[PDB]
Every structure is written in structure tokens, then in C-alpha cells.
Write a protein that binds this ligand. Sequence first.
Ligand SMILES: [Mg+2]
Ligand SMILES: [Mg+2]
Ligand SMILES: [Mg+2]
Ligand SMILES: [Mg+2]
Ligand SMILES: [Mg+2]
Ligand SMILES: [Mg+2]
Ligand SMILES: [Mg+2]
Ligand SMILES: [Mg+2]
Ligand SMILES: [Mg+2]
Ligand SMILES: [Mg+2]
Ligand SMILES: [Mg+2]
Ligand SMILES: [Mg+2]
Ligand SMILES: [Mg+2]
Ligand SMILES: [Mg+2]
Ligand SMILES: [Mg+2]
Ligand SMILES: [Mg+2]
Ligand SMILES: [Mg+2]
Ligand SMILES: [Mg+2]
Ligand SMILES: [Mg+2]
Ligand SMILES: [Mg+2]
Ligand SMILES: [Mg+2]
Ligand SMILES: [Mg+2]
Ligand SMILES: [Mg+2]
Ligand SMILES: [Mg+2]
Ligand SMILES: [Mg+2]
Ligand SMILES: [Mg+2]
Lengths: 65, 117, 52, 151
Amino acid sequence: FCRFTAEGVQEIDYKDIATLKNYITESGKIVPSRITGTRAKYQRQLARAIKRARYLSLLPYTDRH
Amino acid sequence: RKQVSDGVAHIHASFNNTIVTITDRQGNALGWATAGGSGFRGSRKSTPFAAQVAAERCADAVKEYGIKNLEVMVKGPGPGRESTIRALNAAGFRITNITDVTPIPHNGCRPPKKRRV
Amino acid sequence: EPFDVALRRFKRSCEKAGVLAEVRRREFYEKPTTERKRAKASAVKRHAKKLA
Amino acid sequence: PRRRVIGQRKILPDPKFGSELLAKFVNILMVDGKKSTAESIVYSALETLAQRSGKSELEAFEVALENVRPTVEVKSRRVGGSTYQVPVEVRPVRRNALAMRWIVEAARKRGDKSMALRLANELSDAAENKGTAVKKREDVHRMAEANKAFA
RNA sequence: CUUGAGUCUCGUAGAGGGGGGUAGAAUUCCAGGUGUAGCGGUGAAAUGCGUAGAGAUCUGGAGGAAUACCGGUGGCGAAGGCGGCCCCCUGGACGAAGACUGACGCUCAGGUGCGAAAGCGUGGGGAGCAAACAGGAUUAGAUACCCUGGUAGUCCACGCCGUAAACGAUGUCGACUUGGAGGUUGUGCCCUUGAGGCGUGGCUUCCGGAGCUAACGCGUUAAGUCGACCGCCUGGGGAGUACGGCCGCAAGGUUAAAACUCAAAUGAAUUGACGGGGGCCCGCACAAGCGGUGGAGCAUGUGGUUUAAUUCGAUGCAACGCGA
Ligand SMILES: [Mg+2]
Ligand SMILES: [Mg+2]
Ligand SMILES: [Mg+2]
Ligand SMILES: [Mg+2]
Ligand SMILES: [Mg+2]
Ligand SMILES: [Mg+2]
Ligand SMILES: [Mg+2]
Ligand SMILES: [Mg+2]
Ligand SMILES: [Mg+2]
Ligand SMILES: [Mg+2]
Ligand SMILES: [Mg+2]
Ligand SMILES: [Mg+2]
Ligand SMILES: [Mg+2]
Ligand SMILES: [Mg+2]
Ligand SMILES: [Mg+2]
Ligand SMILES: [Mg+2]
Ligand SMILES: [Mg+2]
Ligand SMILES: [Mg+2]
Ligand SMILES: [Mg+2]
Ligand SMILES: [Mg+2]
Ligand SMILES: [Mg+2]
Ligand SMILES: [Mg+2]
Ligand SMILES: [Mg+2]
Ligand SMILES: [Mg+2]
Ligand SMILES: [Mg+2]
Ligand SMILES: [Mg+2]
């Protein structure tokens, strides 16, 4: 839980799909913080990165399209 | 009266009625039957039993196409969502897989107003 | 592969993805004041539950 | 039976054959407390099946029993305020009870100018699975299969 | 003079605001690809679309509006309010360690600005939703709730309106007064550092002490202990109405009485009763069984009717083979 504080990484990258995929369900929906354990400061940056990656077609919005 | 060699089942469901439609992967309808065309109307129209009847009715109505392998896409939160799945698995329908295709708007349009009762 | 416990695998993704609840929720228009009132109700309940 | 479930009262085994099954049978067709009046019909309608209908009277009793026993019965219970004809499974002893209770009701409509003759005729006909008694079991099954939608 | 207030340097978080782009999901419409009889709707129905091909299904396009989850007990804003992503202009808050100005402060009648929604004017735009309205129902009625439609409106630009249960029903600024558990946000230190454990702030949620309160409750974010200033109250109806003034295109807003009328109106809490509020738990209450009553003939009681009299009483359970 709160992985972005153990590593201490200041910024989350929208291009790091290997990390972003661990926070996205098969449906393509962001996982809440009450489930993953991420901090709020980092959950907000996660949501921003996920949306920015979904704009660049690096991630699905829904599981269908 | 003609083959397509495959099929795709599309279970449209509504609280009022359930519709079953066998179609080719290209989306061209081969056969269809509704739980309201099974002789069930009004309240009788909306029940897992009526959808179970409509599933087999559509199965037989398409049976002359020799469909065997089918993909099931189910839609709508009404009852008979799985009842229809089971009742079409009948007649040796080789189910590849299922998928929920229910339309989920991303806060797009205004729904009607809440009913009072 | 069996068809029975292949259909229970459907009733797990279907439910845990919620969509059944979402169709009911988006069925009728909830006024924003009712949204916030219900959010506050759930908040106070599932909060003051885990004290007493 | 709201606090402690007493269950069915225990019964003595049949005097002639030492069998509880047949004892419950005589208890289930005894009218007005007439025990001997009923068992004198029972033992005759079993002797007649012993000599001609089958080889053994006591075993013929069972071969007619399981030939009329039902399995799934609709016990109408409203789950959440709607009339649901939910189908439930019968227990073994209640299964035997229902079976004999239906066979006596079948023998009643037989006529045939006797009571032993009726019981013999219908117990046989049910053992062959072709009796007025078996139709009620398959009608229970029909009504169970109609109402599958409420499981 | 430097402690109040303010400035500078370095950072941090944020749905703060204005502007411009943009993406995906969904709705609707259009054109078609296959295809057949229903679709849709409800307590149940019907109106309503459909055989000129509906709905269902696939492809391609048009368009308007709103941004699933992330999302919170979250954050920001003076308040109203603010939610996809990106850019552009932009306001405030906070922190760290210093330097600088030297009371430059607080409050504020009139004044000026901002101010949800509905509404108004002009010009657009219009997918969904939906006052009025149209039809279908329900009903004793049904100018309603229910259903199929549907116009202004909702959207945009520029003006006006200035009102809300605009609420924390709690004016602003400052000081002081036991604690506990949280969230969010900076930051000093120290572990060997990753985690981790100590210090100090900003905002915020919930308990609770003293005290306060009519009580409920409030409780270091006071409704406690005090100070500065402003607004406001003076029984209930009449009435936030009339008249006048100001303001508005208009709807109306604002300021704001009296005659008359009543002996109360009201706040909180208490004990019951009641609820088409809950939770529970028992009874041949139901379920599971067996046998009846209701039909027939008679016996018996009652009502009614009749009679000179048909003696009086008992009348839902709890009167009617009852006093007898
Ligand atoms: Mg509707
Ligand atoms: Mg912003
Ligand atoms: Mg067409
Ligand atoms: Mg704030
Ligand atoms: Mg003023
Ligand atoms: Mg408006
Ligand atoms: Mg207008
Ligand atoms: Mg216009
Ligand atoms: Mg309407
Ligand atoms: Mg409509
Ligand atoms: Mg008008
Ligand atoms: Mg408000
Ligand atoms: Mg006020
Ligand atoms: Mg103060
Ligand atoms: Mg408290
Ligand atoms: Mg004070
Ligand atoms: Mg007070
Ligand atoms: Mg007065
Ligand atoms: Mg006025
Ligand atoms: Mg005036
Ligand atoms: Mg009171
Ligand atoms: Mg009973
Ligand atoms: Mg009678
Ligand atoms: Mg009678
Ligand atoms: Mg009389
Ligand atoms: Mg009398």
C-alpha cells in the first residue's frame, strides 16, 4: 500500500503503463484508494496520469473500446 | 435455409421485456424472439420464465441455420439475464464466452424525473 | 470446460463491476441536493458506526 | 411449533409383520379409531397381492410405495410479499407418508363392491406405475416443473 | 520601538476564476447492412410508434449537452459556488529560514461590488430533460400523483433581475481557557537509510471536561472567559401588507406602518397514546394434518313477521341449546 512513498518517487508518469496497469481494473475503471492503499496526494496524481494516458490511446477507457 | 457457420447471441433485456437475437459476427440478424412474443403479456412478459421460453423459441427459429458456436452479449439490468443464458445453452449451443455490453453513460444525458408512488 | 461454473464466473465480474447497480442509479434523475444529502447520511452512518 | 420443534410422534411396529411402515399405513387409513376394522382390510389386501399379484406381500408394499413416491413438491411460500410457488425437496419419511396417504385416497374412488379389493387393486396398479395414485405424484412433479422460475 | 499589519526571497497543495482547444462513453436523429412481429408502457392497462419493415442487430455520419469510476469522512473560493484532459492569462491561502517598513491597525451607517434557481430583453443553439399544454388512465371526483407525447425553459453571447431553509438557522477582528481519536497539507530533527520514531505549523471531521444553556445542546473551529465595532429584536394575527419614496422593460424588489383583533402565539424537554415508522417475540394465529360447519331433514335459540297475548332480559369477539 502507498507504494509511491516506500520508493519515494516524487512524480507519477503517464507513460509508465506497467505501473498504471496495477491501478486499473479489467473493466478499465480506476481502483479506489480504500482498496489499493495509496495516499490521497498520490491517488490524485494517479488519476491524472491515467486520464492523460487514456487520451494518448495508451490505455482503454472501457473494456469494450 | 442457409448457413452462416457461426453465430452471436445478443440478449437485450429491459425491466418491461427481454429480447433474444441470434446474429452473425458481422452483425446481421439471423433469428429473433422476444419474451413478449412467447404468449406472455404485461406482468407475465417480465419474468425469468418468459425469457427462458423466448431463448428456446429463438433457438429453434434459427435452428435451420445450423448454428453451433455462439458468443453471448447480454445487456440491460432486468430479470432473466442468466435464465436466458441457460435456456439458450440448451439444444447443444457451444457457448464460447459471455460479456456484459450494458450501455453506461459517462454523466452524459439527463434521465427522466423520479416517479412518485 | 463446464457451463455451470463458467456462469458463476459471469455473476462475479458482473456484480463486482457494479453495472447492475449503476443502471438503477442512472434510471432516474437525482437532484444534486439529494445526492449530497445521501452522501452525508451514508458518511455519518458508516462513520459513527465504527465508534459505537 | 414456534419455540421447540417436537416433530412426529413415534409409533409401534405392525403386530403381524413387525414393520413400522405397514403400521403407519394402518394408522393412515384407520377411520374413527377403528384399528382392527382397518387392519383386517390391510392384511387381506396384502395377502391377495402375496398369492397372485407378486411373490411377497411386504416387498410388494414397497415396490408400490417407491412407485408413487414424489420428489419435488411446490409448497407455496411468499418470500418477500409475492405469491411464490417455491419447489422444495421432501424428506424420506415424509415421502413414505405422502405416498401411502395418496394410495389410500386412490383406493377410495375404486368402488369394486369392497374395501380390500380396492386396496389390492390400487396397490398393484401403482406398483406397476399405472394407477390413479401415481398420476397425482406426476402432477405434483408437473406443478413443480412449471414453477421453476422461482428458485 | 517591533510583538499588530504589510513587503521581499524559496517552495508546496488545490473542482479558485476567465479564455481557447480537445477526447471517450452514452442518448437522440438521419442514411443504409441483415431480419421479421411485435415494440414501448404499467398496479393492471390504454393512448403511442410498427408490415411503407418498427424495436432488436452491425456499419458510417450529424448534433447538442454533461464529464462513470478517480471521489473522500477530500480540496479550493468572501459568499453564491467550483469536477474529464491540455494550453493560455490570472486571484488567494500556506510553509521554511532570514532581511526590510515601522501602528501603516480593527470595525463600518450611507456607498459600491459580487450574488443559486426561476424569470425578463436581443441574437443564437436545441440531443436529453421538461412548467403550460395534448392525449391515455386512476378516482365518487382527479383541473393531481401514473403513462405516451410535448412548448417556453434548461445551453451560448451581451444586458437586466437581486431574490432562497442565500443555513453552521450561529456578523467581523483580537486575546485567554483541561484533553482524546481522525482527515488533509507543508516542514525541522534523528535513527544506517528504505521504510520508521520524534518536533513544529495551515485547514478540516468527530467525541468530550470545566464553564455556559430553558433544555436540547455548544465545547480551543464555543453557544466558555473578555475587548472593539456594526446589523437587528420588543406578544400572536393584521403584514413583510398598505400608502409614499427609491429601483426595475416587466415580474417585482427594497425601505415600512396603523386601525382592528385575540389572551395567548411560541421554544425545548417529559408521560402516555397514535403512525398506511421500525426491530423483535409468543398463542391451534398461520403453516403441516385430521375431522367438521356452510347443502338436506329434524331439534333448539334469536331476529323478523303475526297475534288478544305471543311475558321480561341477554345483542361484535365477550348475545343467539344464554338467564331457563
Ligand atoms: Mg420511464
Ligand atoms: Mg481548475
Ligand atoms: Mg430501415
Ligand atoms: Mg476553505
Ligand atoms: Mg451597507
Ligand atoms: Mg437562470
Ligand atoms: Mg432567455
Ligand atoms: Mg429564444
Ligand atoms: Mg410527464
Ligand atoms: Mg419525455
Ligand atoms: Mg414567459
Ligand atoms: Mg447553499
Ligand atoms: Mg437569516
Ligand atoms: Mg474568536
Ligand atoms: Mg461535543
Ligand atoms: Mg465568543
Ligand atoms: Mg444562547
Ligand atoms: Mg404586533
Ligand atoms: Mg412589498
Ligand atoms: Mg411601493
Ligand atoms: Mg416540541
Ligand atoms: Mg390450517
Ligand atoms: Mg345445515
Ligand atoms: Mg340454511
Ligand atoms: Mg319478536
Ligand atoms: Mg324473547
